[PDB]
Amino acid sequence: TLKLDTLSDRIKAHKNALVHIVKPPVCTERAQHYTEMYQQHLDKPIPVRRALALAHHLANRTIWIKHDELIIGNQASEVRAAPIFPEYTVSWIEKEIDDLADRPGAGFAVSAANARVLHEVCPWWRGQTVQDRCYGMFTDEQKGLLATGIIKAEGNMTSGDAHLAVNFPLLLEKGLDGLREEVAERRSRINLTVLEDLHGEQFLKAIDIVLVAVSEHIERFAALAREMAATETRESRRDELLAMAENCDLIAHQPPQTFWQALQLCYFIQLILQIESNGHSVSFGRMDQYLYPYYRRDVELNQTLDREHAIEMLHSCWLKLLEVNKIRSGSHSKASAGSPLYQNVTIGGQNLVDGQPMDAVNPLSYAILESCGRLRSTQPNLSVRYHAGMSNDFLDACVQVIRCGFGMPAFNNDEIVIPEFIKLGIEPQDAYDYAAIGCIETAVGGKWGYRCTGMSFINFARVMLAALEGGHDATSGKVFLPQEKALSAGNFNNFDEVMDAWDTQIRYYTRKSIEIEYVVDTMLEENVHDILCSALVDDCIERAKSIKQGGAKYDWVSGLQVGIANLGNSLAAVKKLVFEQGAIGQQQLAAALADDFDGLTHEQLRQRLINGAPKYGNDDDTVDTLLARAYQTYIDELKQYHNPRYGRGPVGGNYYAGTSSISANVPFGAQTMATPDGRKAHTPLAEGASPASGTDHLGPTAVIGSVGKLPTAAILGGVLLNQKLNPATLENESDKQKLMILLRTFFEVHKGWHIQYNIVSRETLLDAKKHPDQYRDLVVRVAGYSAFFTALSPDAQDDIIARTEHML
Amino acid sequence: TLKLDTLSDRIKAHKNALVHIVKPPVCTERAQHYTEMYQQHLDKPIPVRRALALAHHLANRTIWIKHDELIIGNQASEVRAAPIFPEYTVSWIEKEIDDLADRPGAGFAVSAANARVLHEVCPWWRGQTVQDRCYGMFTDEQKGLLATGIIKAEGNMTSGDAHLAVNFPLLLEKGLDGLREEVAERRSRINLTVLEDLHGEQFLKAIDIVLVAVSEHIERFAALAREMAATETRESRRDELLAMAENCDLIAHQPPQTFWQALQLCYFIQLILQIESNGHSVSFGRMDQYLYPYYRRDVELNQTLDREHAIEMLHSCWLKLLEVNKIRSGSHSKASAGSPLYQNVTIGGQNLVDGQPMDAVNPLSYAILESCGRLRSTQPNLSVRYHAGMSNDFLDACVQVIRCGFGMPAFNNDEIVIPEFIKLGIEPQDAYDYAAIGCIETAVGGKWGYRCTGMSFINFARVMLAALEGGHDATSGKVFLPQEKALSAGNFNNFDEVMDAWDTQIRYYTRKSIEIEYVVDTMLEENVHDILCSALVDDCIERAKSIKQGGAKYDWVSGLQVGIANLGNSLAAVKKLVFEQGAIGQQQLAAALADDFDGLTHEQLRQRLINGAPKYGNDDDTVDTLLARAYQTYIDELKQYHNPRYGRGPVGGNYYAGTSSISANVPFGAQTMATPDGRKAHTPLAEGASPASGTDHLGPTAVIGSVGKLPTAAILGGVLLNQKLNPATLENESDKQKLMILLRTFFEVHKGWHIQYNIVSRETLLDAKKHPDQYRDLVVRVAGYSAFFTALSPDAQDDIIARTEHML
Ligand SMILES: O=P(O)(O)OC[C@H]1OC[C@H](O)[C@@H](O)[C@@H]1O
């Protein structure tokens, strides 16, 4: 009974207000205060100094209540403005503050007034930021691998970690006051003549400062809700505000009672975590499961609320998550097209009750979905947990919201995740509780460390280019791991010798990436403790230490490998026309590539490369499994390493692979020279594990075939897959059953990680590229998340216009 | 064959030049550079940043060669000037820089020019110094115990640690280059994907920077030795300088060959360790044992050198140790009268060879002693290792140098130390290798952490005052550990109930002292790694971490308990006239003490206290063993604690007691109100474990009897004992045998820790108080060390005139 076409004047009023905020400003309050507190409390341990900085900023910053919201709590002085966090870096800010209103798709209105506040702070943080200090440690060799871009890790060096969901049931069952009580018994057991206890109490001291200021904050919003009602003349909203301060008074301290309370609270947390740290992908976890016992109480039974005012609340909320904005560098902005935050909300899945698995779909799962389908907004990121025994009813209701052309909902697959989690050591009832984090990755909400994916980026295409030409990276002229065999010298005797070169080179860029990651993570852990986040994850409080120090019950991280499709395609093409057939010569190719297929003779060569050799995504086994092998070397490397939290507390403490590379395929391509699959220099790579655009000619069931052949179980950082259909292709009920049997076959027979759809027509993308001004709420799906189309650059825009359009 | 009366014009020229440096200046170079490097390398790990600071300062500072020295290497731009080290503190410097040329016995000429350099640096170090940060951590309660002075620890909060001897045999066997080789193999085994190895390599990186700059420095003194010989016209010294650059060239790199080389090298180290850190009591250890194989080669056999030019070299050296100066606060200066450095040189003892103990006295032991006896200088601090089988010849030669009236040599006692070391876990052949450190304490040179004594000060007299009056400290009006029983309320039922109050109060000031020490030591270990010192102690290089982190093979520390005599005397007096006899009333006493024995009635009361009750030091068992018990509570407390290095590497990791309190008895007295032993308010306490001045009336054999009854074995921080005789009392050979049988009986029958003599007449102390100007090389012994008498304040001067003068 899905009524997906009807908003309300209240929420239509807001959503538009926001989508027209087309060049956001830069609220600078937090970088003002945090410098003060770092200047006033230089003598404190960093966990306490940071707890003060936050408690200061929290009660000296502008707060307001616009748009007649049903949910309240702003990230910044000005609407949709992006705070400034100087602890992680200043370097890209001391290069780029003039050049910021005109930045191809990451433009920030930087007021002459708030620019004054920036020249003032900045030069003091120089030398003492995470990024500055990473460079204080890096070995010289590490420093070159970074300059080139072969291994990239800007995102960890210029931002907090985040990439997790905190323990929202805890927060709800105890309320803040019950966490002070948790903290109090814990510092009751501290002994100050025991080294480890001496450090443990600084971190516990810090937690209490933060917990405190947060209660105070919730009350200084109960404050406004009444000081506003004073000078307010429209009765109907005063009766709302009075209930909100009435509802905020009760959530600043005790466990919440209603639905309106248990969802304002969880937002309050979800916010402060993004004011204390700029890490993106603060997820929500299984919200349809932990807000449900209030939805049931309130509106299903006692019916003191109406199932339609529940759906209106969430909306206000969804729009507050849209309010959350964040500014990134010029370089990293390219790989994060459309300033996203990836705040993920998870619905569905199973639920291990007393040892037996049980369908977890419930009436709030339908209410949450149906509220997303009506709103058509980038936020939240809606991720649905499929399982073999999901209803036909709910899956059809998922296909209904897909035909709404904003990319949601996306799918994750209990059929693959749960058995692999159990298989790593995760507690069986925790493996059933996994959520989506950020984009397509998966963790156990409330019990996992940071970055279940999101660690360092490796460029598979550039590395393979080096395995072909004597270890030489053509982009930068460097040779980091020398070797004799190169194409230009045509002295590979057989293809297996090319595959060896690959196994040899990647084994050395993986070591480096881990050495680099070891520095970053160690700098992040000495300088920037996330106080509140750590309070709200198990088992920090009991171990009295931050997540980065080993506070989390579980801890697994993944990197991101970019260039998947191009690696398969390249190897398979030099395998066929160079070795197998002799059609093309080693030097003839080497000269081809060092030339960017230039001339007319070299162009014929490229086209024989593109179409005279099997491409990944046509259910062709020869290329598909060649790719799985090439990747398998990388997965085999990660096994002889342990991440920095190994042995210091958590379970697991290891790595795995991951393809959730956001829009890094574009700027990563610009750094990759011509490649043997026929790709020209600088053009884009392929995003995620999707097929390279325009090479998949045997339709969608052949695509999922190819994708499902990758070693999914070792790639628990997510296997990203984009598909695009035309709106007329998915139109009748006969077309809907086609999508459904396609999904059910992906997840059950093939064991797929994820799939997300773009239901857009190719002319609509093209009128919005042209007339932005009548398309400023059009949502298209990028890769792991949704974006406002008019907001992406044109590089970003056309990668999305180039993708294959499939029939069902 | 001791010729103790003959210097040389060369060395007489120098010694006088120095003793007239009567208000020293403040060379500010090092605080200039170190701020630069902390400002240029803010991004480095602290171990590397500090290694740079040192390598910078080391090759940008004024260096010279005055006085026609046979040993070269200056601590500072100006002669006898005191560098400035801002890392440990600035606070006492931002209060006291105007008020510094007139400071009762710690006056520093602070040039208007070098005062300019101080206002410039200082305000940047604010908030980031050891002291500033300790206060960033201390619990509020900890902070009050500190304000009062009941527990004091200024010396650890405003200075490096030191209080050790580094591994001088190593340095000599390998030379610097062989330590680069040591360091190189060590970083060869580093793995940069292993957390502990990632930190290990920063510390190893740092060590190499320092090692390097030190070789460079030794060569930039080989530089001067020739650039001077150029513009030099007195042939005879050019032939010396040429050999010194000739000898410095060989010691900047390789293991030294001669005696002149092996003793210039060890000085070079002994110096740089006092430019990198301001910790005092950089000792030398068993120099008569590790320089001897060169003395033997050179002059005993091959005779290429003359036993009289060896004795002239050491002299130059002794005078370079006198050149070493250090500036301290206004408060801490009082407890360190006569700006000393306590650089200790140890001679004699035994020597466990292949499992059998053997006399270690040798011909360099006689040469070192005889060179001290001729020179009559505060530096070095000469400590002799007695054992039951020491010769009559060498002991008489020790008594000869005593009749020289400069306090040296002092005595330590293999008969007590070795069996207690073995008994703690120390390797048997290391227990035979123990040296003296600083004053009277004992450690295993090259294998021990910092502060075998020198940790936190406790005031036994003030604490006992609190056990008498309801936990009330009368000095400051505070009550830190409340209790009902007080004298003013006369409600002790029996004396055992007073002893309980004592056991209860001290058990609580000991906990606090350890909590305080835990903060200081942790701040010292996060902010101020001693690079070179750590390189030269086992087993830092192998564990790749500093001493403070657990680098040292062995690690035991002691505090200092001040007020020993007064505690015994007080308890024994309230035991006799209050309880036992009823002669005096509880309130009558309480009112007595709260009054500073004022009136004429209260004065009779005091005199019955002084002389109507047994005092410690008359071989009286009742008071002697009452004191040992009172102290025994404190020793029993230390057993349930472990110092911060417990479990992190070293052996032992524990505490023990100690009485080596330097001149803290005076300023500590000023903070202690009238006490039941008859002492008036503010007057001095008793220094060390000596008898309270003027209460020991049955002569020296009765004194050593009393002292020997203390629990010596648990007091391995040293039991300090001062004795003073008149020069005519120790004059004939019949008088010498009296001193010798007194010593041999102390150490063998009583098992004494230490004894040192003042052979001065009471009129000589009084003419030098009056006519300073004809007495500026008079040395008198303070407590653990020697001082120039005209340099001590008058408070200091008269504590020394008040001591008992004994007959033999
Ligand atoms: O380097 P960054 O921006 O921190 O990592 C980017 C990550 O953002 C979080 C997403 O869940 C993941 O798909 C993506 O890889």
Ligand SMILES: O=P(O)(O)OC[C@H]1OC[C@H](O)[C@@H](O)[C@@H]1O
């Ligand atoms: O607090 P400070 O000055 O570091 O300690 C003073 C110490 O100096 C080192 C001496 O060996 C010891 O006798 C004395 O107690």
